[PDB]
Structures are given as C-alpha cells and as structure tokens.
Amino acid sequence: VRILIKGGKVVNDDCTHEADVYIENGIIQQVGRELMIPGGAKVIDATGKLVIPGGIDTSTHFHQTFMNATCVDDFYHGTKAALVGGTTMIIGHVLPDKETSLVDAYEKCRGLADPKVCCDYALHVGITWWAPKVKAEMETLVREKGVNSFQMFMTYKDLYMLRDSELYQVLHACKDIGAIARVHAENGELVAEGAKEALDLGITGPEGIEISRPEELEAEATHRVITIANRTHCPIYLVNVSSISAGDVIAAAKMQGKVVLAETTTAHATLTGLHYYHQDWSHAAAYVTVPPLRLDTNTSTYLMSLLANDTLNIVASDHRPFTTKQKAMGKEDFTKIPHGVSGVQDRMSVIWERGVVGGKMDENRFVAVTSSNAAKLLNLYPRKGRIIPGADADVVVWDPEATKTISASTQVQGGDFNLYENMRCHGVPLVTISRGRVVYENGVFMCAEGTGKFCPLRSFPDTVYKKLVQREKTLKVRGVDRTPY
Amino acid sequence: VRILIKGGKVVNDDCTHEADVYIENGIIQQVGRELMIPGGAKVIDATGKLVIPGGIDTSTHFHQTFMNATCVDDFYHGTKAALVGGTTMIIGHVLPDKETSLVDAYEKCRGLADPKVCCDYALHVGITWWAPKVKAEMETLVREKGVNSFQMFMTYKDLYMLRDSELYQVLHACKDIGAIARVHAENGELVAEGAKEALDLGITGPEGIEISRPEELEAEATHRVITIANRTHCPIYLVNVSSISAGDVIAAAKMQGKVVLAETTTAHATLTGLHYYHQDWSHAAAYVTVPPLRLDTNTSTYLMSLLANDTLNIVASDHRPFTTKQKAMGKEDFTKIPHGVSGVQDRMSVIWERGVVGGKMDENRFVAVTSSNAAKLLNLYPRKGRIIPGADADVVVWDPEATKTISASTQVQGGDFNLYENMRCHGVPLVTISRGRVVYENGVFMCAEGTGKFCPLRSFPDTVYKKLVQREKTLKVRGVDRTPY
Amino acid sequence: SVRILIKGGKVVNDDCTHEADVYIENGIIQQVGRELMIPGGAKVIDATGKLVIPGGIDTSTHFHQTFMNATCVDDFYHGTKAALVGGTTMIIGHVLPDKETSLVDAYEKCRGLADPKVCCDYALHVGITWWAPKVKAEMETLVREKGVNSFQMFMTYKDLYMLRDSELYQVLHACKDIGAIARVHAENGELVAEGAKEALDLGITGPEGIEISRPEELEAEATHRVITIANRTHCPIYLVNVSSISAGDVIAAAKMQGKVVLAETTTAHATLTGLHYYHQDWSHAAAYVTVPPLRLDTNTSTYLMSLLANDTLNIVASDHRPFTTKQKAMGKEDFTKIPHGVSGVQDRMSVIWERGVVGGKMDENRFVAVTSSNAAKLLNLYPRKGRIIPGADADVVVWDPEATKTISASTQVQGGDFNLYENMRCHGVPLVTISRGRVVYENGVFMCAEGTGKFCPLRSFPDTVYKKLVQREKTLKVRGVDRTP
Amino acid sequence: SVRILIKGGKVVNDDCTHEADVYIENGIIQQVGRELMIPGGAKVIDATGKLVIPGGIDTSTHFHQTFMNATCVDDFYHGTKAALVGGTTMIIGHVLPDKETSLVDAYEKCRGLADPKVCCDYALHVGITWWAPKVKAEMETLVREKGVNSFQMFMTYKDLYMLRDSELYQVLHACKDIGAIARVHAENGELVAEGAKEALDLGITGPEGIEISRPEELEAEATHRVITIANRTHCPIYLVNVSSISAGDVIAAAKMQGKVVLAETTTAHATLTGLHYYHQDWSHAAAYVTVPPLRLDTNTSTYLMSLLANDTLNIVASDHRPFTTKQKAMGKEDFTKIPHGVSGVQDRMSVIWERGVVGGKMDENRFVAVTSSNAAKLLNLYPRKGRIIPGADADVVVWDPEATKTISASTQVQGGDFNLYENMRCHGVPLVTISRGRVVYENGVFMCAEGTGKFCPLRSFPDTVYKKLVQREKTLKVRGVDRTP
C-alpha cells in the first residue's frame, strides 16, 4: 500500500515545514513539495493539518494484574486506543513478583502481546528483587531479548521495593550492560508508615493517598537515587515525576552535570489532587495513582514548564485503567485502591491543549516530548520519532483546529471515568498511520489484531551513553605520590 | 564545482550517522550511502572523520574601533581565521555612537564587509541611545535591511548604557517587530563606581577589571533585564554570561517559564580570572574583556555544564583582538585597557576539547551549541546548521583524532597572544567548505575576498516567537465584574 | 512615684520564659524575681496564668499623615491610644517630605503633631525622597542632633518618592558613614508605573489592579538590586513590607552569603491573601489596598510567617495608615488612585500571637523577639526596651494567652471603617498595659492624658548591625598585584 | 567561700555587651553592675580592656574513647584541663556502645572514667548504635533517671554504628516521645562503604582517600533524608559535623520550610580545607583525617562560617578526639584504617574568635551564642550556663581580644602530636578561666584538682526546640473528607 499525504505541514521536533509525504511498504519514501510518485496512491488531504511522528508512549500496563485487579485493557484494546489517540508505539511493563524469573515474566508478556498488538511495541522489565539469578537474567534480556530498560521501585515495601544496597548493585549492573534504569522514587518506608498512620487516624477515603505520601517523600527518594546513580556512573531515569520539590531536585542535579533524565505523566502534568477530596467516592478513587496528584495549584504549570524546558524530557500516560467496581476493593481502606488511571488515548490531545494551546511550548517541542525524545532513549531514532525518508511510517495527520470535547462515553480506552471529562481539545488526530497503513480515519478504526510488532531495543543508546564514555575518562582519580611512611 | 565527501560520519545536533555527502552549486544535494553521482567530482576522503555543519559565530567585531583602538582583524582576515577554525558564518556587530544614526553605522559596516568577507555573514545592530528616530531606524532595519537582532548594554555608562525606562521602551519596540534583544547585563552605575573606587585604592593593573566588577553586578543586572523583558513580553537574549550567579538567575527564570535565551564565550566557558593576576602585565591585559573572567575555579565547569544542559544555548568567540601595544593604552589605568580577546579561530577546537573530550556533552550537542541553535535563532535553520539535502554547503570535515597544540605563532587570527596558548586539541578542521567550495584543505587556505555574502535575517524566528503567540493569548487579564460603587 | 507589683505571672523575654514577679517604680523595672521584698502600698496586678512581656514596639506607623491626597484618620493621640490598647507601647512614625523639600522641616512638623499628643513613647524614621548634597547635610543634622538613626527610601512611586540607582548608591554611602539604618521599600518603580498604566488601558479599574499591575517579580528584582547596591557601598540594608516568596528567597540567599541584610514585614502580609482584592464588594476589596500588594499564592502567609520564625524576617510591624471607604473611593474608577494604607496598630500583637504562636510557627519567645526585642536592638534601645529586667523602662504588658477576642471594626479603637481581620477569633489579649511605669489600660478601660508619651532619641551605630561592619572595614584590603617599574 | 570580683571589663552575652563588674561567690554570679558594694577581702581580677564572657561549652568531645582500635590520648582529666586552658568550662562527652550492647552500661563506664577526673562540669550524649525494643527501654531509663536528654546516631559506619531508615524512624519517634534531642551524623553509609572499597581498588591508599571516597553529595543526600524522616515523625533533628556547602544548603532550605532542624559544625570544618589531605608528608595528611572530611572547595570555610554567623548553623564544637601519628599509621597503607579524630578542645575559642570575629563574619555577641549560649539552651541549662547574669553558675572567662597566641603543638596542653592550626596567629586568648566560681587558670598557670568538675543532669524537653512542637501537636488535625454511609 502506497500513501500520499498532501498539502500539510511536517512538524518534527526541530522545525516545521510545508511538505508532502509519500509512504510505501511501511516506510517513508519521500518528503518534499511536488513529489514524483506512481499513480494509484491513496491520497490524504492534509491541508490545514500538521503531519507529525506518531506518539510513543513510554509507560503502559496493558493486561497487567496489579494490587489484585487486572487492567481493563488488553494489548489489543490498549493499542487501538493508543492509535485512536495519535500514539503509534507503546512500551509495556513487565513486573515479575519477588523471587520469580524476569525472563518467564517477559516471555508471558510477549505471548499476550505479539498476537494482539495493533501497533509496534517493546517492553520494560521490572527488577523487583536482587540475587545472582537476577543479574544473569538482566544480561540475557539485554543480550538477546531486545530489552534495554529496567524499572525499579523505591516504594511498595514488601512487594516491589529494593533497598539501597540492592539499588546500588542493580544500577551497577544496568550500566555495565548499557541499559536505562527507570526508577519510581518515593521513600517506601515512609510511605508505609504514612499509610498506616493515616488509617489509624480514621482517614480511609481516597484523599489518604495524598495525605499519606506528601511530596517530600518523593523529593527525598529522588535525591537519594540520583546520588546512588551518580556514584555508580549509571544514567538514571526518574518516572512519574509529580511535584515541584522533586522537579527541583532533578533540575539541581542536572545543573551539576549529573546524568539524569525524567518522565512525567499526562495527569501529573495537568491535574490537581483536589480531585481526591471530591464528595463522590468514585470520582476521587478514579484519580488514585502514585505518586499522587498534588494540592499545590502551581504544580501542573510548573511541571509543564519543566517539560517545555527539558528538565523533564518525556511525557507518558502510564495507562492502567480500573473500573469503579475494581477501585472499590478499597472503599473502606484507601491503601487497597489499585493504583492506575486511564490516559493512553488522551495523552496527545491533552498535552497539545495544556502545552501548546496553553503557550508553554511550541508544536516542535510537543513532538519532542511525545515521540522524539522517547525514540532517542529507546535507540529507535530517527527510525521513529521523525518524519524523514527512511523512517518507519508511523504518522499522524493532526488537526490543530478540532472541536473535540473529551468524555468517558465516547472514549475507546478502558475505564468508566475519563480524568479529563469535559475538557475542550483543539488538537486531534484526523488520520493515524501505523507501519504504513491507515488504521484510523474519518472516526473509524480498522486494524487486525497482531498487526503490530515487537521492536527489539539495542543497548547503549547514544543520547545517554555517548557522553558517558568521555566522562568516564574524565573521572581519573589518582593518589598522591609520596615516599612510604 | 561538485564535491563528494565520502566515508565519513554525518553529525547533526540530533544524531550521528554514517553517510556520504554530495555538494553542487553551493547546496547539499544528497546525503546517504553509495550515492549515484556524476563523475569528475572532487572526492574528499572523510574516513575516520566527522562531517559537521560549519560553525556559526554569533559575536564578532571585525574592523571595529572601540575604546580608541581598532580591532586588528578586518572582515577578510577575520573570516579567513573563522574558516581555518571551522566556522563558516559570522555575525558582526554594528555599534553607533550615542545620538548617531543606526542606519548609517549599518551601511558603513556593510561597505567594509561586503567586498572583503570570505564566508557568509550578517549583522547585529547596537542600540546605544533612545529617541523617536531610533525606533524608526529599528523598523527600517528589520523591514528592509535584513536585520533581526539588536544589541544593548546595561553597562558603559555615558557611552553605550541605556537606562531602565529606555530598555523597557527598546524591548517593547523589538518585540513589536519580531527582533531578538541581545543584552550585556552588568550594572553600569555600579561598574562605574567600582572602577573609580578601585583606582582610588591604587589598583591600576589588569586585575582591576575583576576587582571592580564582581559577579553580583552581573547577576543583579541579569535579573533586572529578565524582569523588564518578561513585563514587556519580549524574548531576551543574555550575552557573555560569565558567572555562576548569573547562570543561576538565568536557570531560575527559565524554570519559571520566562522566555530567556543565553550565550556565552569560549573564554568564559574555559578560562579563569587567575590570568589577571599574572606577573607579566601583557599576559594579564590580554585576557581583559567584560564581564571579566572569574576567580571561582568551579566557574568554567559550571558554564560548560549549563551549555550541555541548554541553560546556555550558544557559544560565541566575541572575537575582538587587540595587540599588547594597543592594550598598553591602559598600562597605568586598567579602565583604559580596551576590552577584547581573540578567539574566532579557537572556538570550535577549544569547545570540542573542553566540552566533548572533557565529557560535558556529546558531539551532537556540540553541533547544537556551535551552529544549529544559532541558526534557529537567526531564522536560518535548516538552511544552515544542518547537514541535509537542500541546505547551504557550509561544511566542515572535522578530525576528532588530531594532534594540534594551540599557539600564537601558528594562528591566523589577529592578536599577539593566544588565550589558549599550549592547549592540546583533539578536534581540528581538516577541510572547510563554504558556499560549496573548499576554502581550507591540507593546511592551505585559499579564497578570494568578497566571496562570502550578506544573509538577510527574517524577523519573528519561530524558535522563539511561535510559542509567544499562544502565550500572549494565555495572559488574558480581566477585572472583576462588580456593580459600580 | 507610682509603684506597681505584677505578681504570679511568667516573664517572657525573647531568650526564655521564667516564673517571676515584677516590681516597677518611677518609670523603671526595679526587681524581677520569685519572692520580692517591696514597700507596702503598691498597686498589685494579679498575673496568675498570664505572661508578662515587653510592650510591643511597632516600627512602622503613619499617624496624621497625608498621603495620595488623603489624611490618615488616626492622629498621634488616637493612634498611640489604639497601640496601647493593643499591647504596643512604642511606635515609630514616618516622616515623608515631598521631593525637593527639607527633611528637617518635615521632621519638625511631625514632632509638633506628636509631642503634645502621644500617649506612649515614640520616635521617627525620616524619608529620603530625593537626593542632592543638601539632603546629605540634612541627614547629618538629623542623626547628630535630632535623635534619628534610620531613614526610609523608596524604589517605587516614580516622580513622587522614587530614587534612582545612582541616588541610592550615594544615599547608602551617606547612611553608612553616619551609622544609620537604611530602610527601603523595594519594588521596581518604572515597572510599577508601566504596569499600572498598562492595566488601566486593559480596562482593569477595580482594586485587583494593585495585584495585577505589580506582580511579585517586581519586588524580587528590586530587592535583589538594592541588596547588591548596599553590598557594594558596605551599608546595612533593611527591607520593608516584604510581601512575597520571591522577595523572601532573595533575602535568604543574600543572608546565606554573609551580606548585611535585615528585613521587616507587616501583620497583613504575614497573615492575609490577595484574594480579598477580587471580592465582589468594591469597598471590601479596596480596603486591603496597600503596597506591595497582598499576594494570590495561597502559600504566601505561611511562608512569610515561617521566615519570621526563622529570622529570615526579623521584625513585624503594622504599617498602620487607615483610611475610610469614603477616602478609598477616590479610586472607585481608577485603582491607581486608591490610597495605600490599611489599619492594624491595634491588631498586630493579637493577630501575630494567633497565627504565629497558636498556629505553631513560633514560640512565645520568638514572638517577643519579632514584636519588640529585635526592633529595640535595631533602634539602639535594647535592653532599655524589649526586655523585662531590672533597670529597663517599664513598658510592660500583662498578656492573656488563653483568653480570646473576636476582632471587629465595631469594637476597635484604631481608626478606619474596615478591620482587615474582621471576625477573626484571636487568642492572646492584652489584659493590662503599662507605659512609662503607669497603667494606661486595664479592665477594658483606657486612662492616659495626651502628651504623656515621650520622644526617644535613637543613637547612631546600633551594635547589632554595625559592630560586624566596623570590623569588616578594618578587615579588608583587596590589593593589586605587585609588578615592578 | 571564695569570693571573686572581676573589675573594669565589658560583659559580653549573646544579646549585648555592656560595661560592668562581676562579683562571684559560692559558685554563683551574685552581682553584675557598674559600681558594686561587696565584702572586702575578695580576689580582684583586673579585666580592664578585656571581655568577660560565659565559659565555652563544647558539645562534642571524646575523652578516653576507644575508636577504630585506637584510644584517644586525652582522658577526662587532661581533656578538661585542656578545655579550661582554652576558655571552655563545660564539655559534653560521647557514649558509644557497640551494636547490640547496653546503652546504660556504656554510660555507666563513662561516668566511672569521668566523675573522678573531670576539672570542669560535664554531661554526656548517648550513642544509639542499634535498634530493638530493648534500646527504647534504655533511652527511657537514661532520660528519666540518668540526666540524659540527647542521643547520637549515625547514618554511616555500616556494620558498626549505622542505623537503617526504618530504625531511624523508630528511634526519632522514641526520642520525641521522651523529649530528647536527636543528634545525627548524616553521610550515606552504604555509599561510603562502596566508595571506600572502590577507591582502594583504584590504588588510592593515602589519606586523600577519605576525601575521594565520600564526596559531599553523600552528606547532602543523607542530611536531606534524615530531615525528611524527622519531619515525618515530628522529632527535632540536630545535624552534626556539617562539612559542606551542599549539606548546608539542604539544612537552610529545610529551615525555610519551617522544619525543626538545628545544626552543629566543628572548628576544623569551619576553618580548614581538605587540601591538607594532599600534603606530601603522610603524617601531616593523616593528621586531618576525620569525617565527614574537610572539603576541597576553597569557599567551604567561609560559607560555613557565614552559616554560623547567620544561624543556619547554631553551634560550634571541637569534636576533640586526638590520636598520635603512631596511631594514625595503623592506616599507613590503607586509609580506611586511619582512625577518625583530630584535636581541638583547647583551640576552639581562639580559632573561632580569630576567623569568626576578627575575620568580620560575626560579632562578639554571636561568638558567645555559637560557643556557649545556644548550646546551653539546647542542653536545657540556660541561663544557668551561657550567660553572665546574677544567679548563673560562675563559669566565666576573662577574654583578651587584643592579645595574640601563635598556636603550636609544642606549647599546647591538649593531646596529639599535631595541631591542625600549627602557626596560626590567633587574637583572643583566655587570660583567666573560672569554673564553679574558682580560678583554675591564670597567669598561664593551671591549678585544679581532678574530680572538681561535676556531672550536670540534662532535663528533657528543652523549650527552645520543644515549646513550638508541643504546640504543633495540639495544632494539627488533618482530617478526611466527610462522605455519608
């Protein structure tokens, strides 16, 4: 199949220019004005529209069982929703229980995903415990299973938390094999104590998740893991950055030349924790995730500015929807509300509205935070994240003059609540092209399950590791030459 | 003339890839592997080399008379030196005296430059006073003379300094016409008083320039002009950022979402003010420029990290050499030492060594700070600052395994001192191509004077102004609707 | 002589609290201890369950002042009565000469209004609203012969009271030479003028204009500027009306660097939000109008209170300048004409007690520091005032920390028709107020003849600032490098 | 009784200085004033031109301690003698039980070594080097019956004294419940262990290893962590041995936020640089070894001194633990075996006088605050100690601010064969030292029987920290949202 996108503006993360785009056999063939193409192409009129790289969502949890609930979206519905939302690649999470095999958990995820995915994907692997067998499995995964990123938690005590000596060893191992170390940095002991205290004070409602983990617990842990990472010489990637305090730690570390990257979520970047205090339990529960949304009304604006600024690099949905009925496992004990919100479909439009229409960043920075930075990180750039000849034809024809209002009743992503309910959005995907085929057009989705493919991710991505080679020569530490005492 | 650069790695600010480059009629025609080209091309072997966009030096002062001395390099020698150093465009300064015509000063500069330049160039225009006639000349300059950037000074009292109400009006006017406001931000009253105090205390030597203007005078002024700029909604561009204090003001402003860009110089980024305390007068005088090099030994590393980080965006030479004999105008009164150091030839190699070999940034960020960011700012990107089909063939074949040691005796730039004397440099230009011709190769320079061209710079560069359109809708200020008292 | 025994209470100084009785005779505290031997026939005041504290010293009052064409409704009699009923036993008033008029004349007129009327001790600050050699000579006369050690300057009120940078420099130089304290209201006046004019042009005429037209960056900028000037002239600088987080942070950073910076805030800035300016009722909104304005950031109060507890801010004042609604209505159609002033001389001790002490931000001793002792040191009156010890002036309040007062305009004795704290339930009430060793308020009755209070000359070079500077002056020779002929 | 009149001097307390004589009888200051009526036959001390200050209180000493397999060379007799000769009249010693051994036993052994030997008053801190319910019960016994109100914890010395996060949490909870002060040495112990091991593997065996292996981020991280823990448990936290700009900034930021944080540093950290570790002579370099180490950043001293002046740091201690060169040489081939300790109990008053007061960082009153008064408040001994007033203990130094002493190992009475301040010319000498109302040092002669000093029980809940917290405890109900069944 052969596709001509005609009359639009191509928007990459570096600049915008008027140009048509010609696609064939999964691949962008030409970009320019007045192209010489074979006749019989499908012509897509993009006048007045922007032609952007499809979104890449670096955090998704399709099919995941978590806190005794199974995410409502499997790999087919989740990728569909992504595509209807202008995202053309997802990275899913693998989360083995403590003491279980990382490789088995990865293979099980591959088995669920390969036959269902509608778009390209790859996987992060969780490191929820530490032992010789874990290190050997890390290695196997990077060496031959196309993994280059692991996820660790500083919180979820007794479930997924690693202690400081374990993190030290884990980061050392990630660095040796050229992997990215993703970390969720809240202080797990202080979280556990805070939750227990709040319950003992009679706070059982969803607001407990905000009260029990104030932002200093995030800032502290973020500061600690940056320091551990800097001592092991491992690039560190903070996830779900939620607060001004943690943003400030990250900015100060970056000023000091430390190798720190950071990601936030659509929700953290746009919504306040005031939702946890809503009179309706279900509404309040529906915003429950960690670290929690914050009360400080400056939080959104500041996180959005950090994104515009490249203090935060990447924005993800962290999609993990649950229904109100599932959330209600914690109707009487907030610590049992499963953590997850929906957003894989909302991400592009929401960030467009608050980021670009809101004047925090321009359309090019929007591409950077929604695809290009991720692609570099994953070692997939410019194959993904850029409209140029030779790249994968993962392309969105984006309408910056659209009329969409977001609602749960029209969404295709799972969950019974949409967090952005009633938000007017000026940017929507008009057409989505994935692997050089139109999968969404005129409001209709059409794609067979299993069309998408796993994309092995090569180790040592340049955008982080290239400078670390030279930096490692720079840390030349020698003693003083004395004669012996 | 037709040129094939074969076997090299193309290094743009986004990534590096193996590819040959084919040039014809001033313009890059193709970039790829195994190109289909007409025979009889000049083939340049770039195996083991990097093929980068030629440098763009955003601050040069060829032919300028300043503080009663005339810069040693005219537009021919200065552009030659730039080219031998891997820089293929320069932006020169126009500096009309108070109460004189901006347009006449610009036309005089054009007259000196057009017949002499070896590479492409454009010009900044200084705004050294304020009146209706100045505003009208700003307009004429942007509307029809290809100017999009003005330079202002917060210091040089009685010579070039603008007062606060004048800066306010100047920034307002720059914004209305889509220009970039460059500002040298030191507190001119406090500078004047400090210089007078130091002289009265018997400090006559070059170290006076460091003692008389400590870094708080920079930080204060930087803070003030950012605030004025934010109130007028004008993008502000700080120049010659020299200190940790001023860097911190700039970072904090950027965290707050203010529209601030910033430039530093090779020297500020790499050298310490310890030089001003050298026993030999000439050595000490040779480092005299403003704001002065700082004593704090962390200063270089921190400014280099800011550059890697994009807290500082761009690095310039600020080339203005004078001889020891000219400097000696101030042998008995440091306030009469003319401000200027040489560096148009040194910039690429020096930053390569301290930036890339030193492990602060990778080769791609190096391109960003030496050409691409400048090009975006100037409204010349991707025509300049990028190796891609259609761009201007301003190209350097850069050897990252070179053996050069810097010395005044081998330099082609003017001045009798080289500031980097004896520095070993691992990166040097092997070949320099300007407007699709080889101008430097096998250590030989060859280019006729006047080969280079003036490049009109269009107003409202997107990389700054695109977001300001949306941001300006965002500042919707309305009263409270009351019934009347 | 009148002889007074305060029995059974706890003495609270700024350093510690102890159980002790207090015996007063002839204007002076004679004894403090647990079991006193006193002449019979004393008036016995039962202070069981009460605290015996030094009377408040309010460092900023504007009795009888005409300002922005309105005359403050409290003259020196009613204003000092109100102070006393509120637990304040000394006031410092402002002298404000029109630009180009005599500082001495304006001081002598204020003395004429105050000396015959004051109920409690007082002194005066003198405004320096312009500069010329003649102003310098008057500063010298005032410190040398008129018991002045403190001058007030403005960086805002352009064309009325604003001083430019070169003038502040000279002014601070002169204050320092004669051992005076330089109080400065630091907002950027040019930007305030332009902001006000721009807000009016945008149709904002309501009181909220005062917030919109001078956002906090105008304060932070100016605070930063004057600290820098002061540091260059070696003059202690004292910031007044600190209103914002930004300006507070500048002050804290300066103090970290060893700069000699002190700072004051007001009751209102420390306790109230600018949301009041957006009230539907015009009068309510106008009533809160003062400068710098109350801020919208909801964290502002808490942060400023914490700064006070922490000694980033040293002193809390009322800045009492009440106007009626009828006078505020001068600006009913143009917010720039609403005269700046709120009431609070009576409210200060109770309000800060409630928000500061009961609110858990500071303890009772720090309360005494920030309401009397720090002021006393600064004024060169410590331990004569601000401390309960033998030999001090008997300005003493018997304070009830348990009892509440609900504040209301209908019950206040201070002037104005609005109380800013209307309906606030305040713990901490003065039960008895003693001034110059007489009971002037007791059992809710006020009893004091006009003109009982005295002017208190304030000696130059107060140790708490100057002792360190004088030593720095001997300390520091920066010297040039020694080079030979 | 012995009766002493100190005549003609200036009394310097932490709040102010005044001219006054001082009369002492029976261990106690009886009178302070200008012209005293005293019984004849007093010993008259002529203090004309001198300052009469409260004797120093050294909050960190390690007399008779065995540590890292070396026994401190000063026992309680020589250590208190040295303190006295140096103007310090009370010491607080450390108790350090091995992990899993009884806090009470270790306290009782220290009491047995001290009670028969001390020349001046003293008390003890108790180390909490492990946690279990049994440790909690011992903390309670100690505060309730053994005159302890202060415990010392370590975040470093892994496997020896380090406490993990869950243990610190529990420990701080317990300290708070019984009204004790939690002193903490905050470096990240895991990272210190790994750093030391990595430095040795890199061939660094010299003393500079102590600097290289624990850079300041390890301190800043841990300081940040324990402040956060403390804030969550509502326990006042007291940081010890603050050594770096990074850790100082964490402390200042925490204090800005109203967190209850106090902090101490040492003479050496406040005055010396880590350049000493790079000295060519092994012994010289080893002699400076302590933790956290002296830092290389040349601004460190000045900044820490400024923090002290500024009350970001409250108290300065010696941390006296001298070893000989012969004992240091345990680590001649492995820097991790050099025992941590430097001498300084005798040097503290003079060194801080010279660098703090003569150096212009603080005045004489603040000097008294940071050498005696703040410590006294913290210990719950103020104004009994730390203040010259009637009724206080007669621990008094007649201090000569003009006279100099050149410090040298050859003339010192404190132990060790190196003085860290060798050859420093110090203004400020104790001329006379009075302890418990007897002259123990005068005319360079020391005269005091061993066991003259007494243990001083330290009462729980010192007001200066706890009065604010106790009120916060009543203050704060965070409550859940009210939703109906």
UniProtKB/Swiss-Prot annotation, chains A, B:
The keyword Cell membrane does not apply. GO terms for cellular component: cytosol; dendrite; glutamatergic synapse; neuronal cell body; protein-containing complex. The keyword Transmembrane helix does not apply. Keywords: Cytoplasm, Disease variant, Methylation, Phosphoprotein. Belongs to the metallo-dependent hydrolases superfamily. Hydantoinase/dihydropyrimidinase family. Homotetramer, and heterotetramer with other DPYS-like proteins. Interacts with DPYSL2, DPYSL3 and DPYSL4. Interacts with MAP2 and TUBB3. This is Dihydropyrimidinase-related protein 5. It comes from Homo sapiens (Human). The lineage of its organism: Eukaryota, Metazoa, Chordata, Craniata, Vertebrata.
